[PDB]
Structures are given as C-alpha cells and as structure tokens.
Amino acid sequence: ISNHPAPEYWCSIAYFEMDVQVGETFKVPSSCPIVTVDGYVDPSGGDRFCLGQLSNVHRTEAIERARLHIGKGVQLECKGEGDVWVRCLSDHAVFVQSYYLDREDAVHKIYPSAYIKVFDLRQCHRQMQQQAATAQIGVDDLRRLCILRMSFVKGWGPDYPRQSIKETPCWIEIHLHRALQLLDEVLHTMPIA
C-alpha cells in the first residue's frame, strides 16, 4: 500500500580512478533495462553514462591514457526483477568482480562483444538468508552480495601488477537496488548485535 517493491532505479554506478570516486553516482531508472557506460562525453544522463566527461584534479598522465580507451565501454541490462547482464562493447577487455560468477576470487576478464550474465537475484537472496541464519558477518560484509565492481582496460587480481581494484586507472562500482531491497528485509531478521 505505502511503497515496495519495485525500485525507482535498478542500479547505481559510482565511477572511480584509483581510490577516489570521480564524478557523481549514476542512477539508472528501472524503466531503462539497458545502460551504457562508455568513455565518451555526452553529459545528458538517460541511458548513457559517459566517463569521458568526468573531471578530476588528481588525474595523472597514466589515467588520461587508459580513459582514452574505454571506448564504447560496456552495458548493464536488467532482465529478471534483479538479474544483471554485461556486454563488452569496447575494443578493450573489462574485468568484472561477481559472486554469481564465482559460484559458476574473480577478475573474470570479459572479452570484446561478449554478452554474459553476472548476477542472479534469487541466488543473491538465498545467500543472504544463508548468512542471517548462521548468525541467528555484518551489513558491510553482506551488502557486497548486492554489489558489482568493474575495471575498464587494466586488470588486478592475483595475476597482475595491481593487487586491488583501487589500483586500476579507472573503474566502477555498481549497486543493485532490488538486491538491496531484499537485503533491507533480511537485515530486520538478524536479531540484535
């Protein structure tokens, strides 16, 4: 009656450059099942999140460089109430961090033109109660399940010069709203801490 479910936005995107968020968070309306995050420069929001138009004083020569290659970037599409798919429209690779992709430890490098599924709401939901049960592990541990991280161009992980995503010249952190909505529900059921 007074609200829920159905989120206004189906996700939020926060661009980064090393350990600093650059530009402001991009909110994608649920009415926009597919969003494109490219290195171009159209400021107008809508379906495109252009990283090429974000300024940063700290920015270096190494990053101006990498940013140059984001290109057509990727796309994030919402299929089932809370299921997210990725499609690398870039000439360069993309490094995704996904738990669903682990069930199937990451740096799941996505290849140009690839169209992969990166998140399963149900699997997420399940896995939450999974943590709430054993507790009956805090909100910052479990909110991770509702999050996706994705580095453009460079990579990290246990096999590159860069150990953590906070080292890539440019990346993004995606929060899936529905997954968080289910998480707000689960949280109310983990009796006092």
Add this chain to the structure above:
Amino acid sequence: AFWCSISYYELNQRVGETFHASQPSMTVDGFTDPSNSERFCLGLLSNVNRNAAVELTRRHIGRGVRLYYIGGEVFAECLSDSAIFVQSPNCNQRYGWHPATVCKIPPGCNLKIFNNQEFAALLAQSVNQGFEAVYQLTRMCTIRMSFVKGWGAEYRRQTVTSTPCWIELHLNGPLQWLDKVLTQMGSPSIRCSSVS
C-alpha cells in the same frame, strides 16, 4: 520542499550522496533500502577506504535515529540500541553549555534538537552586531550527530571527525531566513587581498 538535507561522514571523510528530506518525519538508519523518501539508509553507502572500526560501528547503527519536524521544532529519537550524540548549538545555547556541547541521547530517548523561534530571535539581535555576527549564524543552522561513539569533553574523541559514523544536518528554513538578512548586511570592513 526539503526542510533539511543530511550528509553522512566516516571520520573526516564525506561518504555517500547528500540526502534531501521531503517528509516531516524520517529516519537515518544503517539499513539498505535505496528508494525511501523517509529513510536515509547508510548501510548501502560504500567507502572503498573504510576501516574495521567504521565497519564495526556501522553494524550498531541499527534502526538509527528518527528526526522529525513538529511545528517549528526538530526532534531526534534514538531508535538504535546504542546511544547517539548530538551537537546542537541551538539546543545547547538553550541550557547554556559552550555551543560545542555534545549531548548524549540513550536508546529509547529523544531530545528537542532545534527550535525555530529561538533561532529567528537570535538572528534578529545579530543584525545589530554587524555582518560577521550574521555570517556566523550558519553554524546555528547545522546539527551534528554521531552514532554509537561519542566525542568532545568526557570522551577522548575530541572532534566529530574522530568518530567512525556521524551525520550533519542543514536546516533549509533557517538558512533561507539567514540568506534574506545576509543579502542586506552590507560587506565586511576588514579587507582581503588578491595575492596573500
């Protein structure tokens, strides 16, 4: 309208986007609902450079604090199971202690954190003091709150920037009245150079 916006901080770092309150009664908690005009949920706000302490304290924010606009007065009710400290210059000056006074609000309690008429009257008599005296009233339109940990005298966290989880409130009504007076206070006397 928005009557107030709220900015969340973790130490001396600003975390998350500024929440704008459209509802006369809302809550700032540690949960994760993203689309609630009556719930500023801090749980869903990330911080890539977040420490264990911060992470640990976030867990005890629980139902957080409930802020609410009855008539021309603002109240803070501690829903969390841990206390919440409030530094309200408008609240302190009402019981006297050195504006910087942080006032603990134990679980299940609630305090009147701001009063309009009071402010308005403090704004009136300030016009007589001059520009500078009015410029500084912006502090009176701000209220700071820490969750779980306290600060100031009595705790060896002397500044808000020291606490792990706090939030600042800007009262738009008071700020708008202040703005109307300020655009009429003239200018500073004390000059300022372009090179120094």
Add this chain to the structure above:
Amino acid sequence: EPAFWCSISYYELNQRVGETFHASQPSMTVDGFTDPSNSERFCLGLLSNVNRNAAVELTRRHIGRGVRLYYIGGEVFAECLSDSAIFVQSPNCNQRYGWHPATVCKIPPGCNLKIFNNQEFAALLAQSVNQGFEAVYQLTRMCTIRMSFVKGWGAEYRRQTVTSTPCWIELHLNGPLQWLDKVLTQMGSPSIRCSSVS
C-alpha cells in the same frame, strides 16, 4: 538542446566541496550566501567542509554577490558582482585573443567578460576531425571553464595552479560537450594501444 546548459562544481583548494550544481536558468549566480533552494543561485555560503582552514574561511567571506553567469544566444558571460576580483581560465576565451590556453583573465568588480562562444567552439570542433581521435578527445578541456574567487593564480601570481586557490569552481558546458560526443562516437579509436599491465 540540454535541460541544463551547464553544471558547476565547487572546490576549496584541491578538494571538491558540496554537490554539483546544474543550471536550468539562462541567467544565474554563484555567490557566497546561504539560500539552498534557488534554481538561479548556487549558494556556496551554506556548503560545509570539515577540513576547511583559515585561508578558505577568510576568502569565503569575500565572495559576496559572487559571479553572474549568462547564456545570451550562443555565448556565455561572467560578471563580477563580488567586491573582489574573480579570475577565469577559459581556453575558448583565451584562444580568441591568442593567449597560452592556460591564461587566467582577471575580471575586476563591476566588470564582465565573454568567457565562451559556441560558434567558435563548433568551428574548432570541425577542423579537429582532421587531426584524429586524440585531437578531438582533448576538446573536452574547451568545454570546461575555471574561476577563482578573490585570489588569482597562474602567471602574475605566486599560486600557479587553481588547486592552490582557497575557493574556485569549474564549469562544464553541456551543449558543447554534447556536440563533441556526436563527433567522438565516430572518430574510431586510438591507434597507439594500451596494455592491461603497464
């Protein structure tokens, strides 16, 4: 043509302070006062900075009525309403008079200046297609203008970087950026590749 013809971001030294402002009105002001809900006024006076020092706090008291930004036709002007000068660094403006693109123009109190011109930019965008992706990508800097309140920087001053000034803002011209985008989405890609390890 964009809802907001520009967005403005406030900074205090090398630190972003407050939220980004999106201009809807053809004429508006960035001042040091405290009105939080006016689509014509970006009020810096209410923005807080926990890490703010004396210099910044001292300069914010002199912003006053600030700068007035105008969008008349296909041009943008900046008027100094503040009882202290303002310094602008507009590549579009600077090139028009042939000054090292990093020239900072001083606008005294009461004065104003044409900081941007659309047709000029558009023409520069046209003859850039001929230089390659690189050349175009860098036309984003033409789409941004930086102003400092009260204290000047660059040549002529000791402060050589805008990040050295206590209070400054950065404008992004959406129209120009949008026109640029269209031509970027077609300029192909950079030839000199980029590893995944370097």
